[PDB]
Design a protein around this ligand. Structure first.
Ligand SMILES: COc1cc2c(cc1Cl)C(c1cccc(Br)c1)=NCC2
Length: 348
């Protein structure tokens, strides 16, 4: 048998014999660190249990399997291996995904104090990933630090591909909503720079070491947004559904704090002239990203050319090739049907 099983937490991991020494690293997909004897290197292994179990699990598992293939960029996840220990479609239960192991998630990194060099390099890489996604026709809409990983050398990868076209799940785990753009919160149409919002949230948490827009749900969250950024102006409301527009115009109204107030000099390295200049530059970029109205929010291409960001700028990394299904995102199936779609993709 080419497989063996081991208990990793209260999960069984049945994996190819090449992967040894499974240490758990993730939960909520369960994720392990292992050593790959064939490649003589460390890897992350993630187990999807019955990913065909419902539409939500299935749409995501399937979509991200196929989207893996038409994407190739150092700032986006790529798989080393995909396998199932089960021998037939009938017996099929689990998919395991393998990638090169990384050192930390972005949550852990946000907790640290970081110089402008590492901070701006992280942000540059997020923009490169997002640009590559956009160039392939993928608007993420759901970036969060928990799905971003870093190596010690500050290299970065995005691990998921966001939302599709919902959506109920009987699990006790919560969806993190804090990085979603106003237009996602308020059910608007969106464009590429929806993902710029998420980046500002992350950048801002890196400075503040505190989630920018928290809340039980979108009600609390929207309050957190207008009380810091202030009520959006008339022409923003005009693009809201008449029902959403009513509720938004009827909330307590705010002037909104300035960006020096939101992010004082005290939060920044500002001990040399270099850092004083970078502080101003960081704040200026934040002020252009954390913009409620997407018509005035900065684009990915403009953010890449921002002074804070452009010191890293590489044509290789920015204007990388956009390769390579179609009706993916809009498809609707049953358990039986998603099981086979998934099995086919795991087996090729
Ligand atoms: C610290 O290293 C990691 C930590 C995690 C993950 C990947 C890596 Cl490389 C994944 C992940 C995500 C997709 C596929 C695979 Br394989 C792994 N999820 C969150 C924890």
């Amino acid at each position: 048998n080419q497989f063996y099983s081991v208990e990793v937490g209260d999960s069984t991991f049945t994996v190819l014999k090449r992967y040894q020494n499974l240490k758990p690293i993730g939960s909520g997909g369960i994720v392990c660190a292992a050593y790959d004897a064939v490649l003589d290197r460390n890897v992350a292994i993630k187990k999807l249990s019955r990913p065909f179990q419902n539409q939500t699990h299935a749409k995501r598992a399937y979509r991200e399997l196929v989207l893996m293939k038409c994407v190739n960029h150092k700032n986006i996840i790529s798989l080393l291996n995909v396998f199932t220990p089960q021998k037939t479609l009938e017996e099929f239960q689990d998919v395991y995904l393998v990638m090169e192991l990384m050192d930390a998630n972005l949550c852990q990194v946000i907790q640290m104090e970081l110089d402008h060099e590492r901070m701006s390099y992280l942000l540059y890489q997020m923009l490169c990933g997002i640009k590559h996604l956009h160039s392939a026709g993928i608007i993420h809409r759901d970036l969060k630090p928990s799905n971003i990983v870093v190596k010690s050398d500050c290299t970065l990868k995005i691990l998921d591909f966001g939302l599709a076209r919902t959506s109920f799940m009987m699990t006790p785990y919560v969806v993190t909503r804090y990085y979603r753009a106003p237009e996602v919160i308020l059910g608007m149409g969106y464009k590429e720079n929806v993902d710029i919002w998420s980046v500002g949230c992350i950048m801002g948490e890196m400075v503040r070491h505190k989630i920018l827009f928290p809340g039980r749900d979108y009600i609390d969250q929207w309050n957190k947004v207008i009380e810091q950024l202030g009520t959006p102006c008339p022409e923003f409301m005009k693009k809201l559904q008449p029902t959403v527009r009513n509720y938004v115009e009827n909330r307590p109204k705010y002037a909104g704090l300035t960006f020096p107030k939101l992010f004082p000099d005290s939060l920044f390295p500002a001990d040399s002239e270099h850092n004083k200049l970078k502080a101003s530059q960081a704040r200026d970029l934040l002020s252009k990203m954390l913009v409620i109205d997407p018509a005035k929010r900065i684009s990915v291409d403009d953010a890449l050319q921002h002074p804070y960001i452009n010191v890293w700028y590489d044509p290789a990394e920015v204007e990388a090739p956009p390769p390579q299904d179609k009706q993916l995102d809009e498809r609707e199936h049953t358990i039986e049907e998603w099981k086979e779609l998934i099995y086919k993709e795991v087996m090729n």
